[PDB]
Design a protein around this ligand. Sequence first.
Ligand SMILES: Cc1ncc(COP(=O)(O)O)c(CN[C@@H](Cc2ccccc2)C(=O)O)c1O
Ligand SMILES: Cc1ncc(COP(=O)(O)O)c(CN[C@@H](Cc2ccccc2)C(=O)O)c1O
Ligand SMILES: [Cl-]
Ligand SMILES: [Cl-]
Ligand SMILES: [Cl-]
Ligand SMILES: [Cl-]
Lengths: 480, 479
Amino acid sequence: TKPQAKDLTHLLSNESKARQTSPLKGIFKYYKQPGITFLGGGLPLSDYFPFEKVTADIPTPSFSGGIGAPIEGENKTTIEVFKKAADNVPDQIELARSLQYGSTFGLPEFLQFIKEHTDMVHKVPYENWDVIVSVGNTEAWDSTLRTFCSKGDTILVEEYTFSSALESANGQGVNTVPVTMDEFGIIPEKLEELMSRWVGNKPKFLYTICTGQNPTGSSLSAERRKQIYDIACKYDFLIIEDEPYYFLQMETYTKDKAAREGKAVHDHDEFLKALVPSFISLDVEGRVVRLDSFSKVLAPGLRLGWIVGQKDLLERYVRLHEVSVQNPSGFSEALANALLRKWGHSGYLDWLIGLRAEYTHKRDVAIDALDQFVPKEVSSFNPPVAGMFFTVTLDASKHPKYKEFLEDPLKVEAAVHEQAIKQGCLLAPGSWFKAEGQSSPPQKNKTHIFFRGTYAAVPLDQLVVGLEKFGKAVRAEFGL
Amino acid sequence: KPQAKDLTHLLSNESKARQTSPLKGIFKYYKQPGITFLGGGLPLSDYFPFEKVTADIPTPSFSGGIGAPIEGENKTTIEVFKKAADNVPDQIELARSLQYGSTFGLPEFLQFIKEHTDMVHKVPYENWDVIVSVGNTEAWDSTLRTFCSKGDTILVEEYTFSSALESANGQGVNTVPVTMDEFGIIPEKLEELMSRWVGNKPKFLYTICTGQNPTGSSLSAERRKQIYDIACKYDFLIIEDEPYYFLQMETYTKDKAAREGKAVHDHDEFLKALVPSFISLDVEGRVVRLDSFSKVLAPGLRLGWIVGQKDLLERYVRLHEVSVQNPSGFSEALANALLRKWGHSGYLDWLIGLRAEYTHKRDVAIDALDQFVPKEVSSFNPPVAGMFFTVTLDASKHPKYKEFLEDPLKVEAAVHEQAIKQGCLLAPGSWFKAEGQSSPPQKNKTHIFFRGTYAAVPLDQLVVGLEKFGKAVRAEFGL
Ligand SMILES: Cc1ncc(COP(=O)(O)O)c(CN[C@@H](Cc2ccccc2)C(=O)O)c1O
Ligand SMILES: Cc1ncc(COP(=O)(O)O)c(CN[C@@H](Cc2ccccc2)C(=O)O)c1O
Ligand SMILES: [Cl-]
Ligand SMILES: [Cl-]
Ligand SMILES: [Cl-]
Ligand SMILES: [Cl-]
C-alpha cells in the first residue's frame, strides 16, 4: 500500500470549492429500496428507447496486416450491444443502461478497463488516485481551467503551444505566462529561475503537452520530467499533462536505414519498458492531472477520454461535469467498452504497438526527406521521438532581405510561408503558436523561426513531394 | 421575412472577445489541388477501427405503440459504413463522422433538424439557424457563458430545475425568481417587476415553458405572447429550455368515454395541437431555444441543438470549439440515420405515439390523485405537458400548524416523512425554490406542494404509490 497524496484542496478555485450536489441527492437512497414507490425522480423509462441493439465491425488482434489493413475476413469481428443485459456477452453496458442518465464519474465497465490500462502503464505511486470520464481533452482542459483558476489567475504554458488551449484560457480571463523551450521542450533551469523570483500570487499550474508537444514535436526526457516535477513540488503548483499523443511514441530515429527493422519493440514487455515515464508515474504527491483521449488512438469522433488524478480533485471535476457536459455519448462509451473488452488489454496493447510501428515509419520518411531536401546552411531539425509533428528551424538572420525586413524574423517567416505556398506546399508558421501573457501583478523584466509539419495527414509519397517543394522554397528565399 | 434585431449588445464582454483559431489563415488551402497541405493536425481515417456501425430501430407508423418489441416488421436495421460509397444516400460515413469537423455540426444532421424546426415552429425572421449541442445541460452552461458575466442577473421561474440554478451559481450569475401560479409565470407581475427595475437590466429570462420542472405547468399561448411583449419592451432575451416540448398531451377530462374522440390521430391535427414556441413568436430574434433528444429518443444520445439568430449562435460555436468540441460522431451519425430512415413523416408518427403514451400515463396519475388524495386540504392542476404532476396542500389546515409555529416547511417535512413511512416518495416543492438578488438588489404563504412523475414506474405501481400518498396526507391532516 502506497502513501496518500498531499491535500491540494487549497489549489482549487473559490468557485470550484463552492459547487454543490443536487438537493435531490437527499432522496436518492430510496431509489433502490423495494417497499417504496419512488415518484420523486425525473428518469424516462428505457421501454421507449428506439434502439434494440447497436453493432460495429472492428479489426482483430494482433493486427498482423497492420492497423490500417482492410476490416474484412479474418480482420473483421462484429461487436454487439443489445438493449437488455441478458442478450449480451459478459461485461457490456446494455443500451437500457448506457442510453439512460447515469453517474457523471462514468459507466463502471468502461472505468474498470481504463483504470486497469492507466495502472498497467503509469503505476500511479499514491493510493487515493482515480479516473473519471471526459468527452475528450478539449473539454477536460476547459474543465481544468474552471476547477483550478479564477479570472486574473496565472498558469504556466509552453512558450509555443496549442492555440485552442490558449483560447480556452483567454475566455476565462486566465493569464498564460510562457515557459522558455529549446528544441527538446521546457528548459527546467529557466522554469526554476522564473519561480525562484516569482512576484505576487503563484501560478496555479503548468500546462504541458509533454509527449509529441504541439507544435515543436519535442518530448520531455525522463530527466527533464523529474526536474520539472521537483519544481512543481518545491513551489506547490499542479502539472496538467495534456497527453493525446502519448501512444504516438516511436523508435528513436537513426540515419542508418539498414538498422531500422531491428529497432522495433518485439513484445508487450519491451513496449511498456520503452514508453517515457508520465508525470502521473512520477507523482508521489498527487499534484498531477493527466488528460487522456482516444482521439489520436481510435478516432476523434468518439468524443471520449478520461482524467487521472487524486480522488478529491476529480470529485470537483464531477460536480462541474454534472452541470456542463453531463456524460459522454452512451453510444461512444458502450461501443468503446465493447471494442476494448473484445480486444482485451492484450489486443489494445497490440493496437498501440501497431500504432507505434506506423508512426515510426511516417517519421523516418519525413525526416529522411528534411535531411535530403532542406538546405543545411540556414536550417536545422530535431527528429521527433513521439507525436505527429516535425519542425524545420531557419536562421532568419541569413535571409538576403533581413536588413530590408527591418531585421524582423516574422517577415522572413511570412516570405518563406508565401514562397512554400507558391512552390505548392503548406506548413504552419511557428509564430502562430506563440503564447503571450503577464501575471497580475507582472514579473520583473531571436533570429530563429520555425515551421510545423505533420507526417500523419497525407500519403507518404505526397509527404516527400511536399518537403522537396519546401526545400526549393527555402533555397529560393535564402538565395542558395 | 424581416432581419432579427441586432442583439450583439446582450452578449457578455467575454463572449464578444472569443476568436477563431489562428490556423483558419490556412484552412482555404486545405482542399486545393496543387498544394501538399502539411499545416494541419488531422490523424488519418485509414486507421479508424470502425468499418461499420448498425442499429436495430422500430418501424413507422409504430401502430403497436412506440414501446412495442423491436422485432419482426417492427425492426429496421440502419447501417453507417466508414466509406460513403457503401451507404444509402444522405448518411454521415464514419470516415467523416469519426473525424474532427465543423463545431456547427455535421451537415446532413443540421439539415434534417433545421427542416424539423421550421416545420413545427415557422421561425418568423430570416437570419435564424441551428447549431448542435451535447444536450440541454451543456447548452444551458453555454448560454450562461455567452450572455452573462459574474454578478449579472437572469430571471428564473420561482420554482425551477436545480441543475440550471447550480450552473448559474457556479458562474456567479444572480437568479432572480419570477412569481408563478399553478399555470406558470404570471406575466402581469413580471411586467411590474421590470417596470420597477433598478440597475443593469437582467440579461434574459430562463423558462422551462412546456412541462415546467417542477410545477408541471405549461405557459398558455396568451401568457407566451404577454411575456414576449415584456422581453421586447425591456430588451432581454428569452431562453426556452424545452426538453419536454414533445411530451404535450391531450387536455385532461374526468370523462373516460370522451378521451379517444378528442385525441390527435393525424399529422395535421398534431401540428395544430402544439402550443406555440417562443421561437414561433420571435419576430425580433431575441429567443434562444434549447432542444434535446433526451426525452424523445434517449438521454444517452448526448445530442441536442440550439435555435436562434446567426450572430448569437456564432458565439456559441466559438465557445463550443474550446469546450465540448462536438457531439459524438456515433450519436450524430446514428441519429441522422434513424431520423432519415423514418423521415419527417416517421418522426411525426413517433412524436404522436409519445403524445398518446404520456396522455395515458397522466390520465392514470390524475385519476388516482382524484380517487385517493383528500380534497379537504389538497388541490391538483392536471398537466397538459411533461412528465411531472403536483399535489398542492394547505399547510395551514395541518392540526400541528400552531405547534409548527405556522411554518409550512414543517408541514411539508412531516408529510414527506409520513409518505416515506407509508411507502411512497415524492419530491418536496420547497427544494426547487430559486433565490437570488440583483446587484444592486431590487427595493422591497400557506400552500406547499410535492412533485411526482408518472413517467418513471409501471402504471400499476403508480396507483399503488398515490394511494399510499393519499393515506399519508389523511394521517398527517387527521381526516
Ligand atoms: C494539445 C492538444 N490537446 C487536445 C487535443 C484534442 O483532444 P480531444 O478533444 O480530441 O481529445 C489536441 C489535438 N489537436 C487538434 C484538434 C483539432 C481541432 C479542430 C480541428 C482539427 C483538429 C489540432 O487542431 O491540431 C491537442 O493538440
Ligand atoms: C429543464 C431541464 N433542462 C434540461 C434537462 C436535461 O437535458 P439534456 O442534457 O438531457 O438534454 C432536464 C432534465 N432533467 C433530469 C436530469 C438528471 C440529472 C441527474 C440524474 C438524472 C437525471 C432530471 O433529473 O430530472 C430538464 O428538466
Ligand atoms: Cl524531442
Ligand atoms: Cl517565432
Ligand atoms: Cl398548465
Ligand atoms: Cl414552497
